[PDB]
Design a protein around this ligand. Structure first.
Ligand SMILES: [Zn+2]
Ligand SMILES: [Zn+2]
Lengths: 1333, 90, 99
DNA sequence: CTCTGAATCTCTTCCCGCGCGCCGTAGGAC
DNA sequence: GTCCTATCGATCTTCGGAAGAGATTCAGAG
């Protein structure tokens, strides 16, 4: 049936009877000897359908001639047997029964509606106590549960003026008595009666549930099951096994238990069994229904085997093995196979080799499609036989069929889209799949026995889509960043490095070659060496600004290898790229440059030719590796012999008591580290110096042709950290607790490691292996969360028309910059007109894409901050505008309308998740940001600001260094001084926080008493002490309310006033303070009154996206103004923030042990830090704005990848951020029909406010709410996507009671229901449908 | 054979619209097969479609131009039949 | 191993899984995400309706492939209907809608 | 006397394929 | 032997998860 929406709601019992075709009565299915289905059972023929294909069970009719008629020998209706899997039945329970889901969801829906605790409703339902209903003229409330002894009281104290039922009957009577709308009105007016938010929130939840039930056609008693439908039998087959036995079926046994119990209850109720017996039977029946529905939510699951609990309906719905993730989202497909791959170097970039047998077994029908068309076979019957005969003509048919038919290859797992690609197949004799070398990088495919699967696209559109989107040559750029995925392989780069290298003296040196071709001849005639230095006439073509090549020819000083390689580089590049010894880095840009100039078609053939030449000349190289090539520097034995001795000296101090325990350790380890550095440097120097050659006279050194050195230098394999362990020393190691081993592994793998050294190495080896094995799961879970939170977003519009955006600046932290501006802003469109450095002059138009040329133009100027449009700020409803997203990183142009950016971004973020771990510097100009500072006695600039940051701008006018300076620091280099690198810029006390005054004047211990607020310490070191201020915890109110104060005093009654300020120079003391300037002491400006003494990898980002609150929440101040204290710390301290104007009495509780950045009079603003530590993304969004929280998220998730060397385009993160805060909470209901306070989807609230403001009525006011991905994925308005993700047993009830309806918008739902996705070609089809409407 | 499709992508300014147009044309050439506007090389219609696009002689509009016109021809003969039938009854 | 056509499972008509049984490769959720990363919608629709799930469709596809038509009739994945029954077996009335 | 704090309760969750290979109603009454 | 009924309706189902999130209780708290 054609459909356009899916609706979910509660099922009324008469609706269930409408579903059913019969009532199952006998709990029997089939005979244990004959295989006929027993009538009126779980497999009744006349209820669900006949078992035979087109014949009735009774055998009266066996033809289509009697189709649709009803037999009277057995009662079964004869029709297509398939209908047997669609017809349902129903069991009419002898007594009502509560639906387990609605009883025990995350809240209790049945409990919430009646406002009755879940424990008490369960106690009633399981026949433990009575509950009085319609109590009438009795002192018994509306529900007022009462026990049997209490009931025994009411039985005689009152007569029949009260009613107290037990079990589901009482709950059904209560539901049937629910005056829903009147109750909701009364409660929505009672909400205003009290301000108890602790109860107001759950009251809002209750009224929301009541409104959802009122609006929906659902009725309360429908939460209590009365008729239980039975699943169609063909969906729960009782399949036989080897021998005369049938395989056990989980659902069948649960239904059998329910039917038997219910029949027993009916039998008793007919025979008038005593109340105790009928109550026990009813409880057993209720518990049996519980086991049938959601087995496991009971006290204990039932089982019929060695404690293997039986799977229930709810068990089959959800779960990793459930339908959603087992058969709908991912399903096994025909026309597919798998095999072990191997490398075929002869293949082109766009080809792959497949076995003849696999080709025949996948393209079988296509072969038939020729056998009839060729007329060589009569029909399928002979065509299949001929194919079996593997006739030599059939191989010609296969060679014709497979001519231009792509095949899809994908390796498991496939983290990113580059793991699935289309290839043009070629037949191969063997059984392994021939894969291309350059492609193996994309698959992460090591050829050490790696299996890979092939899928055959059948239809025409599938073939075209494969060839146009998934072909190998269409995926040369990585979608995660502007980096080619055809990066040259490990072996090829070795060949190119060997070919283009130059030696001092070599055969055929110094002559003149008339052209590259001749050079090649010389090598192949053996007259010249490949590394010989020679002058060859080179000719190069350069395309003009218009785009036509200009030929220029010249003499060039170069090498024979480079001249040979130049015969492969296309006719558009300068010779300087090949005039250098190429390595895995140097070659890569080369290839990239081709795509920058020539285009895709020249680039692919150039890559293939590079691979061919590299393989050939690497084979000619014969760069073997042997034990003779691992060089131990001779000085190493000395470097050890000295270093150990130094440790001995560090030991001697410990042998003399001249050092502490820890200092000995941290000196020994540092000395060993220095020795290791010396050993490594000597080893590297020896490796490069091992080559010295005679150039016609006198020895001369040069770069080393050592095999290991060429392998390392070319970047193929074995970097410096590898050669250091192979030829230097293994170095230090760490214990499983991470402690540095005092005795390093002073050996290297060329020499033998001893038993203890190997055992030490095993610690780190197993730690790394366990890290990999454990992180491989968290990475995948993060990928799933990302895809299920971002599956909705598609580029569905050209321009949204907005003008906002985000400003991009180079990352300057820890001094020098860590990344340039070009990387951030490349490929985005400008937000507003870009101004020339200076004033009144613009440089780029307001909505122009900043491609490579404009990025170079900006880098030419001194532009550091550029505002560009971002996907988070785009104002497009239920989609994302194309202009914000900007460049498609895999194409280079602007992103097309219809691309699924969400899944691409999720894969881009999640692919490197398996690479993480689960366990002044230069001269410039001084700039001060947020730095309010005062002049001390000496006139130095000492900071009076706590958010002070130090920014340094070089001579060419851009900031290159950034620093943060805490409160109380003295700025030696300030007022825009120019200071050279390494010259101390500022000074600080690294241990304690000092407190300083503004004026110079006398002081007293105002309102302070010895013993009450200060301790008469002695300072045993000298006997003259600095008084220690008593804490709030160490003293009672006699010292807490007597807060220490060091207010500056003068004879005039006031201090020298700052213009416009009336505040006296009042200063105070917090706890743990150490104060020297006692009474009668003159404190000058800038004098320190007193002093107060005092991370991760993958989880650091996983909790960041989930927006988990920090264990140590750095409290940010809100509003603005000047802070204050309230009452002191008892239980936990209380403080108050007083703005200049507005609501002065704003208070907030504060932890005692967290030191405060403000004490009593510090000017404060929204977001001002009161304590150190990580912030809260929720608080940041609430206090500093959407742009601020987006910047925080992007930077704190990029700091994880930058540390590990992974590069991901920042935009790929912002999309996920767009998903986190897709919801908003209403501030004022306004003219909108929205609730007074409610969280509504931001798109809906925005469209409603747009139309409302168009009509001039009061639009709603809202705060965008940052939801972590794990919750926001389940918070969508389409219940199918949420229930397909997790907590299905919860969502399938929350949406059920609400009468939810799905419009099937999004990708996952359309994939589930088997229609075209709203993306790509599917988006094109949907867009055509909507425009033609 | 086609290794790349960049030229056609430059012709039809979208990576997906090219797929759809080529599907239309290759379906035409396959079922009720109209002869292609390009010399064959023992190729499958799929690639032949991607051959025609690069020559710039097939797109949406042209196909629409054909389809509508074809319909008119199929309608025109209808009149010649109907009138003839109306004549033949007399 | 490679499979063209063979055994089909009973409860859901998806092809069997394994080597000792003539089964096909499983198209996991990650592969679906990768296909959605490209604009390939027809590929996904075929892969999850005709090749695997829609019982009526996968025969009509067979005839066309033999006939040389290369056109699919997707219909609706049978497995999905099974899901509905599993939910319709509860106290939940979930149904398709016209508009 | 409850209110609006914490604190202490239960529930949900945990990568993708791929192969082997076994192992798979029970006790009691006519 | 067959075929039956019922399912610790006189035990103790495992202690080598972590966490993260709510939901549910309590506790000074005025
Ligand atoms: Zn019959
Ligand atoms: Zn936009």
């Amino acid at each position: 049936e054609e459909f356009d929406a899916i609706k979910i709601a509660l099922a009324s019992p008469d609706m269930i009877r409408s579903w059913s075709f019969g009532e199952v009565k006998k709990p029997e299915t089939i005979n244990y000897r004959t295989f006929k289905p027993e009538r009126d059972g779980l497999f009744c023929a006349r209820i669900f359908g006949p078992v035979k294909d087109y014949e009735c069970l009774c055998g009266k009719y066996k033809r289509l001639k009697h189709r649709g008629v009803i037999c009277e020998k057995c009662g079964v209706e004869v029709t297509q047997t398939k209908v047997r899997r669609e017809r349902m039945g129903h069991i009419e329970l002898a007594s009502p029964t509560a639906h387990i889901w609605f009883l025990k969801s995350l809240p209790s829906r049945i409990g919430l509606l009646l406002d009755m605790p879940l424990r008490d409703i369960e106690r009633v339902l399981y026949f433990e106590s009575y509950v009085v209903i319609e109590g009438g003229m009795t002192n018994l409330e509306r529900q007022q549960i009462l026990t049997e002894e209490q009931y025994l009281d009411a039985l005689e104290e009152f007569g029949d003026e009260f009613d107290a039922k037990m079990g589901a009957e009482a709950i059904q009577a209560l539901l049937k008595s629910m005056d829903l709308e009147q109750e909701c009105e009364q409660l929505r007016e009672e909400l205003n009666e009290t301000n108890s938010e602790t109860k107001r929130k759950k009251l809002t939840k209750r009224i929301k549930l009541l409104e959802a039930f009122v609006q929906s056609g659902n009725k309360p008693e429908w939460m209590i099951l009365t008729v239980l439908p039975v699943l169609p039998p063909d969906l729960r087959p009782l399949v036989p096994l080897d021998g005369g036995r049938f395989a056990t079926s989980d659902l069948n046994d649960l239904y059998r238990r329910v039917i038997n119990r219910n029949n027993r209850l009916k039998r008793l109720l007919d025979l008038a069994a005593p109340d105790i017996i009928v109550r026990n039977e009813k409880r057993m029946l209720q518990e049996a229904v519980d086991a049938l529905l959601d087995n496991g939510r009971r006290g204990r699951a039932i089982t019929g085997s060695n404690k293997r609990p039986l799977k229930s309906l709810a068990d089959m719905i959800k779960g990793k093995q459930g339908r959603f993730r087992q058969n709908l989202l991912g399903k096994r497909v025909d026309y597919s196979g798998r095999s072990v791959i191997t490398v075929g170097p002869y293949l082109r970039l766009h080809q792959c080799g497949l076995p003849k047998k696999m080709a025949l077994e996948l393209f079988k029908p296509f072969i038939y499609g020729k056998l009839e068309l060729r007329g060589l076979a009569t029909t399928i019957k002979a065509a299949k036989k001929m194919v079996e005969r593997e006739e030599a003509v059939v191989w010609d048919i296969l060679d014709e069929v497979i001519r231009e038919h792509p095949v899809l290859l994908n390796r498991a797992p496939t983290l990113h889209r580059l793991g699935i690609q289309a290839f043009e197949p070629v037949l191969i004799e063997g059984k392994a799949i021939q894969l291309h070398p350059l492609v193996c990088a994309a698959y992460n495919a090591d050829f050490d026995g790696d299996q890979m699967a092939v899928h055959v696209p059948l239809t025409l559109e599938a073939q075209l889509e494969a060839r146009a989107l998934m072909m190998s040559t269409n995926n040369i750029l990585s979608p995660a960043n502007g980096e080619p995925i055809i990066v040259p392989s490990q072996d090829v780069v070795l060949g190119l490095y060997y070919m283009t290298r130059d030696c001092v003296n070599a055969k055929g040196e110094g002559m003149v070659l008339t052209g590259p071709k001749e050079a090649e001849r010389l090598y192949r005639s053996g007259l010249a060496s490949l590394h010989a230095r020679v002058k060859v006439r080179i000719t190069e073509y350069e395309k003009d600004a218009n785009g036509e090549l200009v030929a220029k020819t010249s003499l060039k000083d170069t090498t024979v290898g480079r001249a040979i390689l130049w015969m492969i580089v296309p006719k558009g590049l300068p010779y300087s790229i090949v005039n250098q010894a190429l390595g895995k880095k140097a070659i890569s840009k080369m290839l990239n440059t081709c795509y920058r100039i020539l285009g895709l078609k020249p680039t692919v053939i150039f890559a293939d030719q590079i691979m061919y030449t590299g393989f050939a000349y690497a084979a000619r190289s014969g760069a073997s590796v042997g034990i003779d090539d691992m060089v131990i520097p001779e000085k190493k034995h000395e470097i050890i012999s000295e270093a150990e001795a130094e440790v001995a000296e560090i030991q001697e101090q410990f042998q003399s008591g001249l050092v502490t325990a820890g200092e000995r350790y941290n000196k020994v380890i540092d000395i060993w580290a220095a020795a290791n550095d010396r050993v490594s440097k000597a080893m590297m120097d020896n490796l490069q110096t091992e080559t010295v050659i005679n150039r016609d006279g006198q020895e001369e050194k040069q770069v080393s042709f050592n095999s290991i050195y060429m392998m390392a230098d070319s970047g193929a394999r074995g970097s410096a950290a590898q050669i250091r362990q192979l030829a230097g020393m293994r170095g230090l190691m760490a214990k499983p607790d991470g402690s540095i081993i005092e005795t390093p592994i002073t050996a290297n793998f060329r020499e033998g490691l001893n038993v203890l050294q190997y055992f030490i190495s095993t610690h780190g080896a197993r730690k790394g292996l366990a890290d990999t094995a454990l992180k491989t799961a968290n990475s995948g879970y993060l990928t799933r969360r990302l895809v299920d939170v971002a599956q909705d977003l598609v580029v569905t519009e050209d321009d949204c028309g907005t003008h906002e955006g985000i400003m991009m600046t180079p990352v300057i932290e820890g001094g020098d910059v860590k990344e340039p501006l070009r990387d951030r802003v490349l490929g985005r469109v400008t937000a507003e007109d870009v101004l020339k450095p200076g004033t009144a002059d613009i440089l780029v138009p307001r909505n122009t894409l900043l491609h490579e040329q404009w990025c170079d133009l900006l880098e030419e100027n001194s532009v550091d901050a550029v505002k560009v449009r971002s996907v988070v700020s785009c104002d497009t409803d239920f989609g994302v505008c194309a202009h914000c997203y900007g460049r498609d990183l895999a194409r280079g142009h602007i992103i097309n309308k219809g691309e699924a950016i969400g899944v691409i971004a999720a894969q881009s973020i999640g692919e490197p998740g398996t690479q993480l771990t689960m366990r002044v510097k230069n001269k410039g100009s001084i700039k001060l940001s947020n730095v309010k500072s005062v002049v001390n006695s000496s006139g130095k600039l000492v900071i009076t600001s706590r958010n002070t940051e130090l920014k340094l701008i070089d001579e060419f006018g851009r900031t290159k260094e950034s620093y943060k300076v805490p409160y109380g620091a003295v700025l030696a280099k300030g007022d825009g001084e120019q200071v050279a690198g390494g010259e101390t810029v500022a000074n600080w006390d690294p241990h304690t926080m000092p407190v300083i005054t503004e004026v110079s004047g006398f002081v007293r211990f105002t309102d302070m008493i010895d013993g009450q607020t200060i301790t008469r310490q002695t300072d045993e070191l000298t006997g003259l002490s600095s008084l220690v201020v008593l804490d709030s915890a160490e003293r009672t109110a006699g010292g807490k309310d007597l807060r220490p104060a060091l207010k500056i005093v003068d004879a005039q009654g006031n201090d020298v006033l700052i213009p416009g300020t009336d505040m006296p120079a009042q200063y105070f003391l917090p706890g743990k303070a150490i104060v020297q300037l006692e009474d009668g002491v003159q404190i000058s400006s800038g004098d320190t009154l007193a002093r107060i003494p005092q991370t991760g990898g993958l989880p650091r980002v996983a909790d960041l996206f989930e927006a988990r609150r920090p264990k140590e929440p750095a409290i940010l101040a809100e509003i603005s103004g000047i802070v204050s204290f309230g009452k002191e710390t008892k239980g936990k301290r209380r403080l108050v923030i007083t703005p200049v104007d507005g609501s002065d009495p704003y208070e907030e509780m504060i932890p005692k042990w967290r030191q405060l950045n403000v004490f009593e009079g510090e000017r404060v603003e929204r977001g001002d830090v009161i304590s150190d530590g990580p912030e809260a993304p929720h608080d940041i969004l609430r206090l500093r704005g959407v742009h601020a929280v987006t910047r925080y998220i992007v930077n704190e998730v990029q700091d994880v990848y930058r540390l590990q060397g992974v590069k991901i385009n920042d935009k790929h993160i912002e999309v996920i951020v767009r998903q986190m805060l897709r919801k908003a909470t209403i501030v004022n209901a306004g003219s909108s029909d929205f609730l007074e306070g409610e969280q509504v989807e931001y798109s809906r609230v925005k469209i409603a406010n747009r139309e409302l403001e168009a009509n001039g009525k009061v639009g709603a006011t809202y705060s965008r709410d940052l939801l972590g991905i794990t919750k926001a994925s389940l918070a969508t308005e389409s219940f199918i996507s949420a229930a397909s993700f997790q907590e299905t047993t919860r969502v399938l009830t929350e949406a059920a009671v609400a009468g939810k309806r799905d419009e099937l918008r999004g990708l996952k739902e359309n994939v589930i229901v088997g229609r075209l996705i709203p993306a790509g070609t599917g988006y094109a089809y949907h867009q055509d449908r909507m425009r033609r409407r | 054979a086609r290794v790349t499709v960049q030229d056609a992508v430059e012709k039809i300014g979208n990576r997906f619209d090219l797929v759809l147009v080529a599907a239309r044309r290759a379906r035409q050439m396959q079922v009720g097969g109209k002869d292609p506007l390009v010399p064959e090389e023992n190729d499958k219609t799929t690639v032949i479609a991607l051959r025609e696009i690069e020559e710039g002689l097939i797109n949406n509009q042209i196909l629409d131009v054909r389809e509508r016109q074809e319909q008119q021809e199929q309608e025109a003969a209808e009149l010649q039949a109907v009138t003839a039938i109306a004549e033949g009854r007399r | 191993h490679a499979r063209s056509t063979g055994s089909y499972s009973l409860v859901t008509q998806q092809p069997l899984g394994g080597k000792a049984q003539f089964g096909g490769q499983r198209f996991g959720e990650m592969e679906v995400w990768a296909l959605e990363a490209y604009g390939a919608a027809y590929t996904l629709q075929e892969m999850l309706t005709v090749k695997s799930d829609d019982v009526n469709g996968r025969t009509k596809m067979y005839k066309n492939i033999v006939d040389g038509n290369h056109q699919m009739e997707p219909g609706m994945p049978e497995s999905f209907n099974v899901l509905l029954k599993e939910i319709r077996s509860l106290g939940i009335n979930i149904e398709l809608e016209d508009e």
